[PDB]
Subunit: 249 residues, 4 copies
Amino acid sequence: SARTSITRREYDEWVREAAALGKALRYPITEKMVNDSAGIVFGADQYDAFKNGMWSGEPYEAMIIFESLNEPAVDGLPTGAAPYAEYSGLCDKLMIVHPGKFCPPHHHGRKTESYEVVLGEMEVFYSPTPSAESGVELLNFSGMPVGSPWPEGVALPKGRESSYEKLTSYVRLRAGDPKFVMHRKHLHAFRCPPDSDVPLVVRQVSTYSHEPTEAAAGNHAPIPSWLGMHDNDFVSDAANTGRLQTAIS
Amino acid sequence: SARTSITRREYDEWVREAAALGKALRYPITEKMVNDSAGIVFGADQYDAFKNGMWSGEPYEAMIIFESLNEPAVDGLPTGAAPYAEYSGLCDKLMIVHPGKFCPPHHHGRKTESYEVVLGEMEVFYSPTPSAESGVELLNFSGMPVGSPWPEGVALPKGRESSYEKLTSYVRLRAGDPKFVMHRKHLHAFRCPPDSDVPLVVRQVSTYSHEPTEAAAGNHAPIPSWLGMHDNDFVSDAANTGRLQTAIS
Amino acid sequence: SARTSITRREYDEWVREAAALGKALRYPITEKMVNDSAGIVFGADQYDAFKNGMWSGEPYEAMIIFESLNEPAVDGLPTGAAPYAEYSGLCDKLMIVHPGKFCPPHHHGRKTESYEVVLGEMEVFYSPTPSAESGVELLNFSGMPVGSPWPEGVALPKGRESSYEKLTSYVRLRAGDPKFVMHRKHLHAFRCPPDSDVPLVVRQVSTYSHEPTEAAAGNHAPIPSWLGMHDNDFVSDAANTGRLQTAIS
Amino acid sequence: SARTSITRREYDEWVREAAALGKALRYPITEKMVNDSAGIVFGADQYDAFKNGMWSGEPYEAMIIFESLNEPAVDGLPTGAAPYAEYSGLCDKLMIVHPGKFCPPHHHGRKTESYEVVLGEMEVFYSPTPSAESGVELLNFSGMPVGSPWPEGVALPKGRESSYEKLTSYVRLRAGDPKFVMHRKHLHAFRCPPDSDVPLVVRQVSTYSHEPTEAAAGNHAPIPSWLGMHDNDFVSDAANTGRLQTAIS
Ligand SMILES: O=C(CO)[C@@H](O)[C@@H](O)CO
Ligand SMILES: O=C(CO)[C@@H](O)[C@@H](O)CO
Ligand SMILES: O=C(CO)[C@@H](O)[C@@H](O)CO
Ligand SMILES: O=C(CO)[C@@H](O)[C@@H](O)CO
Ligand SMILES: O=C(CO)[C@@H](O)[C@@H](O)CO
Ligand SMILES: O=C(CO)[C@@H](O)[C@@H](O)CO
Ligand SMILES: O=C(CO)[C@@H](O)[C@@H](O)CO
Ligand SMILES: O=C(CO)[C@@H](O)[C@@H](O)CO
Ligand SMILES: OC[C@@]1(O)OC[C@H](O)[C@@H]1O
Ligand SMILES: OC[C@@]1(O)OC[C@H](O)[C@@H]1O
Ligand SMILES: OC[C@@]1(O)OC[C@H](O)[C@@H]1O
Ligand SMILES: OC[C@@]1(O)OC[C@H](O)[C@@H]1O
Ligand SMILES: OC[C@@]1(O)OC[C@H](O)[C@@H]1O
Ligand SMILES: OC[C@@]1(O)OC[C@H](O)[C@@H]1O
Ligand SMILES: OC[C@@]1(O)OC[C@H](O)[C@@H]1O
Ligand SMILES: OC[C@@]1(O)OC[C@H](O)[C@@H]1O
Ligand SMILES: OC[C@@]1(O)OC[C@H](O)[C@@H]1O
Ligand SMILES: OC[C@@]1(O)OC[C@H](O)[C@@H]1O
Ligand SMILES: OC[C@@]1(O)OC[C@H](O)[C@@H]1O
Ligand SMILES: OC[C@@]1(O)OC[C@H](O)[C@@H]1O
Ligand SMILES: OC[C@@]1(O)OC[C@H](O)[C@@H]1O
Ligand SMILES: OC[C@@]1(O)OC[C@H](O)[C@@H]1O
Ligand SMILES: OC[C@@]1(O)OC[C@H](O)[C@@H]1O
Ligand SMILES: OC[C@@]1(O)OC[C@H](O)[C@@H]1O
Ligand SMILES: OC[C@@]1(O)OC[C@H](O)[C@@H]1O
Ligand SMILES: OC[C@@]1(O)OC[C@H](O)[C@@H]1O
Ligand SMILES: OC[C@@]1(O)OC[C@H](O)[C@@H]1O
Ligand SMILES: OC[C@@]1(O)OC[C@H](O)[C@@H]1O
Ligand SMILES: [Co+2]
Ligand SMILES: [Co+2]
Ligand SMILES: [Co+2]
Ligand SMILES: [Co+2]
């Protein structure tokens, strides 16, 4: 009785409620943002999240993301920055994670992120050590803070506990806290505490998001290389694929 | 009886109330953000705004900006992007403009902006035509939309009406609207309608903000060139100077 | 395949999401308010609402109510007001109605209500004519406004269309509108427009709510008569019973 | 240099900003609610609050109240309740108190109140002992909770420290807390902590408010006795008078 997809009703209810919560919190959600790509389930084995539901508190990798902005910011750029334009751009998204659920371990080669908790509390797991890129020298300025060790008793998704191994640092963010930056090339993940009375709602402001998603298929590329470019590297292979498409029955 | 500065009481009341409004609207304002650089008056001749006050509805160039993020995003960047890192980075700020007041005409060579109206309505004046940069070729992708002609009867600050000449396009933005992008190298300005019952509150998400302001004096530069770099070009000279410092008596 | 009850999962998800929406909107929801009495389905035949779900837009009589206050206000009252204390008291509740769903036709003999729309829009159907009370003279002051005729094409719950007959007046309320008063002894009902992108959220401030509900069973009576007193008279008999208990399987 | 009135500019700025804060917090404020009666200063000697301003943190008795509802609730009442209708009715108001400022000691003979903190924290001082009414027996049900002793170092308005003597009980309320009831015939007062970064915003839901204020002069009385009826008894005589009118120069 292992779920392999989500019913149209489960999907619509999940995403529509999330959009309303977003609107209540004053996030500018338009009609086109409420689509079949907003609700993400990272891998077939994660559809079991809808076995007991989004309020069961069980650890699964699934989340909602409403993207209000993903601007290349290529206009006005000297032609020389062309090869580096992919590290810039502006992206604004609202992320909604239910109790116990996770945005799984992954890293970006080009995208730097920042978090602003709007509702609930966010538990961020990450590697304070950045990854390297074979053959290319990289700049450094502030790097990432070390944070604290994980609190005791964190329930990880069954069959994916090892994917969190390297994300040794932990920080719990709350509404009103200073903005938190997740530099590119750093492994990161996050969840909404299982005992939370509300879904975790986080505003993410980042550089351009290269994600050839279902709702992405059908857009013009500002620069050749960008075409089909995927800037998401999930530690769990089963998470990289499902990331781009949601099975709705 | 022309004002040349703002009293400490006028300043504190202006900024503290604005911060509370910001908090009420869920913008993450920390203590360090509420300082003597938050309240901006663009030029000595604009201090007359406090002659009758921020609720008089008279046209003056003054505004409040609370910056929650100004991240260089240099970490993890290949060394080659060093000369172009200044066109990237992440900046999050809350802007508060009272009825009739303006954020004066200006343009940025490196910074691209985006607007999200949180409270009230925003009247944006801009040039759909970007400016050129002597000797350097520039990329183009989407450019700016033409918008509409100005509505009739817009009261401009006395003695600065000509600075708005080239900003022929107009767009009125409201809460819930799609994000609006102001590409770098485009002249832009905005005001809160004079008949508004509430101050205009706008969330600005942009690339790095190079502004050697009073609260800026005393920060490490991620890259040599960035040091003291000012990326703001106001059409009105009296606005470029006052931008960096507020006279509080 | 006609539903006769709601599953524990459907109930919890319905009420927990509603509570989060309420919190997002700053309504003071405590743990004890999130119980098995919050989600109301008016009659067995209305459980079919969960056949297609709360986002189907179909007309059914079901809603959520979180009560933050139900104060008798008997303390300090001269003993003579004892028999009339039941017409007073203070009650504060947040009401959440999904698209197309209704709070069914009913009237109160003692309770006067008021509505404040927090999210979405509220369509109120009511009788501008108050009902009489055999043998007892009644006071009059402002009475109810006539309002407008019903808009065309209002889909009513199947098998209960006649219960709306006498509620000839219509008013559509929005956030920011003046408070709307529903005087005692007036038939009233309301729904969230079927095409609404968000659940209707309304703050109700009224005199004491005499409702021997499931979560009510087990409270001290400030005055003898109040014990077990039910002040709700639904035009539809199938709505009076189900009002007090929700079948959760 | 003792203030005896508030300038039109000081008044408008005080009330207009407060209204905007209220709107930001989703309180339904209409145009007619933003008038010259909204800003209250309890006595000539309290105008010195505007000597240093509403953000000085000094102890003075002044506040803002926006009334969205004051419904007699007389309609549908059996004629016998006529003499007791004055203890009922519905009143909804938003109260805004700046740091260090107080709503001064007073009690109501007919009105029972309840508090819901929307922004900031509320420090309530009150007498757990109700006052008696010569010759008339009174009902009792729950009475008031004892609360805690006052915290140390509470700065009271100069020249009115004795008016707080009997208000021995203290409770600090926060957003999200259960509704707090202030029964009629109990002395009560409250302030916004002097170190608060935001004005205290509280939603008050109470029975009818008999207050022949400036904005009150010119309304029909639902019942004879109600005419000109004042249900506010301030311990400080200088507070009873100024309560009904604000001196605006
Ligand atoms: O990509 C953009 C513009 O940045 C949006 O129109 C979409 O993400 C839909 O909101
Ligand atoms: O990167 C993140 C969260 O770290 C989101 O913007 C999405 O890319 C997750 O798939
Ligand atoms: O610059 C940063 C980090 O981006 C902030 O700490 C300051 O702007 C203060 O909010
Ligand atoms: O650029 C803007 C508004 O266009 C702000 O971020 C400040 O730079 C205005 O001085
Ligand atoms: O009844 C009261 C007090 O008025 C509340 O405690 C309950 O309704 C639970 O919120
Ligand atoms: O009266 C109403 C809505 O008219 C609510 O407070 C509940 O009593 C509905 O059952
Ligand atoms: O009194 C009433 C109705 O209760 C309101 O119209 C005024 O208080 C103005 O808001
Ligand atoms: O009673 C209160 C606060 O206790 C308010 O509603 C006003 O009456 C204060 O003047
Ligand atoms: O609007 C889509 C939907 O939610 O409405 C009815 C059906 O259940 C489907 O899931
Ligand atoms: O594609 C639109 C839609 O069906 O997809 C998700 C959301 O429920 C919306 O109704
Ligand atoms: O609206 C946000 C989103 O779901 O829509 C497109 C993209 O896939 C992103 O995940
Ligand atoms: O030391 C390199 C590494 O193993 O440590 C952290 C980074 O993610 C990379 O995987
Ligand atoms: O106890 C925390 C931890 O060691 O356990 C699992 C995860 O790898 C994390 O590093
Ligand atoms: O806190 C600073 C201040 O507002 O408080 C008192 C004085 O008026 C000054 O302007
Ligand atoms: O520098 C801090 C401060 O005085 O500056 C502005 C704000 O009023 C705050 O009180
Ligand atoms: O808090 C925002 C701000 O006022 O502080 C620093 C910078 O000058 C910016 O204008
Ligand atoms: O044509 C160039 C120009 O005059 O037009 C718009 C741009 O701002 C520049 O000033
Ligand atoms: O009427 C609008 C306008 O022509 O008047 C002033 C400004 O230059 C703008 O272009
Ligand atoms: O917490 C209760 C619940 O939602 O959690 C799991 C099960 O589905 C049940 O409905
Ligand atoms: O009784 C408590 C509860 O189970 O009832 C409804 C809500 O879901 C909560 O979890
Ligand atoms: O919390 C609100 C409520 O559901 O709880 C008790 C009462 O039945 C009311 O309907
Ligand atoms: O005229 C009396 C009546 O029929 O009209 C309205 C009220 O509800 C009652 O039912
Ligand atoms: O058309 C509206 C109406 O006449 O139709 C049904 C309901 O009785 C209402 O009075
Ligand atoms: O609108 C009224 C006012 O605020 O506007 C100008 C003058 O200062 C007066 O106080
Ligand atoms: O009477 C209206 C008014 O002048 O009074 C107070 C508020 O400032 C508003 O502008
Ligand atoms: O709007 C609220 C108010 O100021 O207006 C009328 C009454 O005096 C009350 O104090
Ligand atoms: O005992 C009566 C009394 O003195 O105590 C409390 C009440 O306010 C009254 O003033
Ligand atoms: O210390 C608190 C207190 O005793 O001091 C003043 C006020 O009367 C209150 O009762
Ligand atoms: Co990421
Ligand atoms: Co700009
Ligand atoms: Co009712
Ligand atoms: Co009172």
